[PDB]
Design a protein around this nucleic acid. Structure first.
Lengths: 146, 71, 22, 341, 92, 48, 97, 170, 49, 64
RNA sequence: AAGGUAAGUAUCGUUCCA
């Protein structure tokens, strides 16, 4: 039938255009910095140099006489107990990955993994079983507690 | 002996990094005298380690015992 | 249409070596 | 299988016999059937579907391309105002063709060529050639044939629709394309036949197998960075749960000597830093590079293992001046976060 | 932490000066305390995963101690393993 | 003419029979040495 | 299959023949969630596409020699000045050459 | 390239840890020297990731001058010296109190522009700074060298190196 | 004296004329593999076995 | 060596247990050494002591 | 006209032939 309109992608073209764009950005930045930093008698007087040294030496003589936080906790409120204190570490996140911060406790996380394994062994709204793979339970933590 | 055989014939990280040859990334043909010799991900900006792949020492060329005797 | 390679003899009327390579 | 050979390409024949082994074909057809059977089971009351039947058919119906038969059949609770035969991308059927009780769906698979990879034409053409047939057996004039192109991962459906059936098929197929055990294993076999992989770069991972080679005469540093940013959180018996940040500690344990270098991490360093995770990521790297530059050359570590994979990246930059230092990630959930307890 | 401490102090004295960290025991008490800690770790794993400790052979005992444990969420992806290729029935 | 800077001659260039025959023989010995060589190896030799 | 570069699965074979590509090999279809869509490459009605020949991608020896003379003159003028100005050269100056 | 050659013939770090009945063994915090241009270089693979790392960190830890310095080294090595100049001139305002950053800016700036940098560094660090001699041989004329030494003799004239440079000046 | 030829423009024009990444990958089995995009891939020129 | 091997094949003595040192401790017994490390090192040191004692008392028996 | 046979294990039918 009729083929619709759409550009062709070319990895050489993409890389060359990116490099050329970066070079143009560098040119603009250098032109800006030329304006930014380009706006800056006693040059060869040795007798006045000695006089200024003397006045510099004499000048010293004349001057001689944390509750605040907005982090999220990947746990349920029910997962905590009462009448006891729990330590909350930080979850592993890559430096390049810009996802939000996640604070978890290793013991509760391990318990969740163990119970998840037990449940998944125990099994041995449109197409949810395969959607959960193609697609966790936490709470916003503000003002030192929800 | 088998451990040393596996070390000599094992895939050094620089060797295994050269086998990977990227995808959809044209590179300038190195070694004019014989093209088709591309180092792949070795020294490539596509993927790999941030630090340069350090050279191994187990794969260093070695002379025979009888030849060293001749020396 | 066929994949056979056609000799560019007589196909050089409007082309140069250095063109499209700068 | 159902792949057709326009010429004996023996290498391709061997490759496709290897790829479609374990009767992947019949299994992929059955997997497409049953999970597509499931979606109608959920929305059967909403579509006046009395029952959904998956009749026992010839096991080789998956690749029997000359003839065909129904495999999923809907028995209606009441008459449906069936629509005209139309494609899956259509939206113009005003849904007034006829009235039927039985409603079949036929699923046919394809490994399309380059020229003939038009799946919708395939579907409509053999819907016409299987309904206007004397060898194909379809219980009712109404029905839709669904065509799956494995080689190009295309999906189409042409035939009769009852109210609400077409969008439901659209959504179900959009989900089934992106996730299905049979199609996933087919994709994996194709990937390993071409040996084209996505990411998964090779590094020495500390694991249960290579755990023995750790015990060597070269000094090793176990950089553990879990206990850097941590807050004591506790839910009181009646009052709301309250939090208080506390100090962290980097672990630079050395199995050879046991000298656990430990930089106490004051809470003041986090002076309202928005991206605190990355700051914690490079704060440990700063101290480990400082310690490496601090120790004498014979005491410099020749191998740094790391508990959490995120820390693999920063070290290589702060170890950019030390190319001879191997930085190995650990698959081992190695218990050093509890060392601070 | 608590049962681990109780195991770590098998003797009521349990001498521990600020010069060192772990309790001062000689070799055989170290044998006993390590056996106790191994039993504790396998007991905790068995409680968490509902598997008797004896069935765990030495290989997976080492896996548990070091930090290896696997699951089977993709259990239906076993297809690699009168022909029973359409006999399977659909249950509503 | 460097002394006068004028177009005074004209050099017609050509590839001699020896070079053409050598290249043809090189392609021939590429093709005959293809009992088990991969397609990529043959084409790499051809491009080189 | 032939003239596709090596990392895209092809053999990266260089050519110096008038190799025509039929317009049945420049058409590709992708199935978006809404529906299948199709594309060509010569989206305006134009001539048949032609594989580029190596002939047009190698500078003639005449141009190379005259440019070598000119460029080495530029380098000599850019180096003798650097002696007087007392600095080593750099990629920035010689990128144009 | 060597001007006498013709056609026919790194990641700095301020911190430093001192080694050495008490289990607690605290160690002193030592600050280190600056890093000059090293002969060793280019020991980097997969630049498109390392540049991203250094980019992310120069806003994640914007008060760590060796981050900017390592960025300068990396971008100077791989044929992008001009962008390295721009990035150093951008980052010098983020850590203006570091001698190493100004030294790198001076060594990565050509001609009179270099003067514009070195005549500016003293504005932020006018007390007992090696940058003064960088100005001294960064310029050309001996008279300008005398003026630079006098300015050094005018701002914190307690440097023995400054006195030695100024004494043997005409 | 360095390599006296350049092929980056030649490969650029070959990709442009062949239809680009999608114009070539349509001929391949790439869509069968079902990778979300063609970036972030490498070719294993040698199987470990 | 051949006489010893023939006797062991008969079974008059047990098959030779692999001689293990500190450097071979985790190569040979490491998987079994993770559970009870101190017991395993005690056993390998006992084997070392038995070898050294066999050597020392062999010399003593051969002493003039 | 080709260079395009996967090799097998089963019962069943038929037929010549001993």
């Amino acid at each position: 039938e009729e083929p619709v309109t759409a550009d062709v992608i070319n990895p050489m073209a993409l890389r060359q255009r990116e490099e050329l764009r970066e070079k143009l950005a560098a040119a603009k930045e250098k032109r800006l910095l030329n304006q930014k930093l380009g706006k800056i008698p006693w040059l060869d007087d040795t007798a006045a140099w000695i006089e200024r040294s003397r006045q510099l030496q004499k000048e010293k003589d004349l001057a001689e006489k944390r509750d605040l936080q907005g982090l999220t906790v990947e746990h349920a409120i029910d997962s905590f107990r009462e009448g006891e204190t729990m330590i909350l570490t930080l979850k592993d996140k890559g430096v390049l990955q810009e996802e939000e911060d996640v604070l978890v406790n290793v013991n509760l996380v391990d318990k969740e993994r163990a119970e998840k394994n037990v449940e998944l062994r125990k099994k041995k709204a449109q197409q949810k079983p395969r959607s959960i793979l193609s697609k966790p339970h936490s709470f916003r933590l503000e003002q030192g507690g929800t | 002996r088998y451990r040393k055989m596996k070390e000599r014939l094992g895939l050094t990280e620089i060797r295994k990094q050269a086998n990977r040859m990227s995808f959809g990334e044209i590179e300038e043909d190195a070694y004019q005298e014989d093209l088709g010799f591309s180092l792949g991900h070795l020294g490539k900006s596509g993927s790999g380690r941030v630090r340069q792949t350090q050279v191994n020492e187990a794969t260093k060329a070695r002379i025979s015992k009888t030849l060293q005797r001749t020396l | 249409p066929t994949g056979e390679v056609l000799s560019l003899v007589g196909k050089l009327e409007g082309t140069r070596m250095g063109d499209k390579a700068q | 299988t159902g792949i057709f050979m326009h010429g004996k390409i023996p290498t391709l024949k061997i490759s496709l016999i290897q790829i479609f082994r374990a009767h992947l074909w019949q299994k992929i057809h059955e997997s497409i059937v049953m999970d597509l059977c499931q979606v109608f089971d959920q929305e059967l009351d909403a579509l006046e579907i009395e029952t959904v039947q998956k009749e026992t058919i010839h096991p080789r119906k998956s690749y029997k391309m000359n003839s065909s038969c129904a495999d999923i059949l809907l028995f209606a609770s009441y008459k449906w105002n069936v629509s005209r035969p139309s494609l899956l991308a259509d939206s113009k059927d005003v849904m007034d063709s006829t009235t039927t009780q039985k409603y079949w769906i036929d699923i046919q698979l394809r490994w399309g060529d380059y020229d003939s990879h038009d799946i919708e034409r395939y579907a409509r053409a053999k819907f016409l050639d299987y309904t206007t047939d004397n060898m194909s057996i379809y219980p009712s004039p109404t029905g839709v044939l669904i065509a799956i192109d494995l080689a190009y991962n295309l999906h189409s459906a042409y035939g009769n629709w009852f109210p609400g059936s077409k969008p439901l098929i659209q959504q179900a197929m959009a989900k089934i394309m992106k996730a299905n055990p049979a199609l996933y294993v087919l994709r994996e076999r194709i990937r390993k036949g071409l040996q084209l992989y996505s990411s998964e770069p090779t590094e020495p991972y500390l694991s249960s197998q290579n755990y023995g080679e750790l015990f060597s005469n070269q000094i090793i540093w176990f950089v553990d960075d879990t206990n850097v940013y941590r807050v004591t959180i506790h839910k009181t018996f009646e009052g709301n749960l309250t939090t208080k940040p506390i100090n962290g500690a980097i672990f630079i344990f050395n199995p050879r000597t046991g000298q656990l270098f430990l930089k106490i991490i004051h809470t003041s360093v986090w002076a309202g830093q928005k991206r605190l995770g990355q700051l914690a990521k490079w704060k440990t790297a700063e101290e480990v590079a400082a310690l490496i530059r601090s120790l004498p050359v014979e005491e410099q570590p020749k191998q740094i293992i790391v508990t959490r994979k995120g820390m693999l990246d920063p070290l290589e930059v702060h170890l950019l001046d030390f190319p001879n230092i191997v930085i190995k990630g650990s698959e081992l959930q190695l218990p050093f976060q509890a060392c601070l307890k | 932490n608590d049962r681990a401490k109780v195991i770590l102090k098998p003797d009521k004295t349990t001498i521990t000066e600020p010069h060192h960290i772990w309790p001062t025991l000689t070799d055989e008490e170290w044998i006993k305390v390590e056996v106790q800690l191994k039993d504790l770790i396998l007991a905790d794993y068995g409680k968490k995963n509902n598997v008797n400790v004896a069935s765990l052979t030495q290989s997976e005992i080492r896996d548990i101690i070091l930090g290896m444990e696997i699951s089977a969420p993709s259990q239906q992806r076993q297809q690699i393993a009168t022909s029973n290729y359409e006999t399977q029935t659909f249950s509503s | 003419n460097e002394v006068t800077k004028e177009r005074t001659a004209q050099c017609f260039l050509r590839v001699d029979d020896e070079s053409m025959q050598r290249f043809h023989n090189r392609v021939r010995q590429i093709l005959m040495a293809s009992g088990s060589t991969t397609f990529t190896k043959i084409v790499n030799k051809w491009n080189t | 299959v032939f003239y596709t570069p090596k990392e895209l699965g092809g053999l990266g074979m260089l050519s110096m023949g008038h190799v025509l590509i039929p317009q049945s090999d420049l058409r590709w279809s992708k199935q978006t969630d809404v529906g299948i869509t199709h594309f060509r490459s010569g989206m305006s009605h134009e001539e048949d596409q032609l594989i580029p020949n190596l002939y047009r991608y190698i500078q003639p020896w005449e141009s190379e020699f005259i440019d070598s003379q000119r460029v080495w003159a530029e380098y000599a003028l850019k180096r003798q000045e650097a002696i007087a100005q007392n600095r080593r050269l750099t990629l920035e100056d010689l990128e144009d050459s | 390239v060597d001007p006498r050659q013709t056609q026919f013939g790194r990641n700095t770090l301020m911190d430093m840890r001192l080694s050495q009945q008490t289990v607690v063994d605290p160690k002193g915090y030592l600050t280190d020297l600056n890093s000059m241009i090293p002969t060793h270089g280019g020991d980097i693979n997969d630049i498109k990731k390392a540049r991203l790392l250094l980019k992310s960190v120069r806003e994640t830890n914007p008060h760590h001058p060796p981050a900017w310095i390592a960025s300068a080294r990396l971008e100077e090595v791989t044929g992008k010296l001009q962008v390295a100049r721009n990035l150093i001139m951008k980052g010098t305002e983020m850590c203006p109190k570091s001698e190493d950053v100004w030294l790198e800016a001076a060594r990565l700036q050509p001609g009179d522009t270099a003067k514009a940098v070195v005549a500016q560094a003293v504005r932020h660090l006018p007390q007992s700074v090696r940058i003064y001699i960088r100005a001294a041989e960064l310029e050309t004329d001996i008279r300008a060298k005398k003026r630079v030494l006098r300015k050094a003799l005018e701002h914190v004239p307690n440097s023995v190196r400054l006195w030695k440079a100024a004494v043997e000046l005409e | 004296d360095g390599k006296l030829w350049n092929l980056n423009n030649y490969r650029t024009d070959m990709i442009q004329a062949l239809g680009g990444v999608e114009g070539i990958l349509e001929h391949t089995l790439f869509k069968g593999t079902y990778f979300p995009t063609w970036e972030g891939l490498f070719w294993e020129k040698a199987s470990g076995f | 060596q051949k006489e010893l091997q023939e006797k062991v094949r008969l079974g008059l003595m047990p098959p030779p247990e692999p001689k293990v040192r500190i450097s071979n401790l985790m190569r040979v017994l490491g998987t079994e050494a993770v559970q009870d490390p101190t017991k395993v090192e005690a056993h390998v040191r006992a084997q070392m002591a038995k070898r050294q004692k066999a050597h020392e008392e062999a010399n003593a028996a051969r002493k003039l």
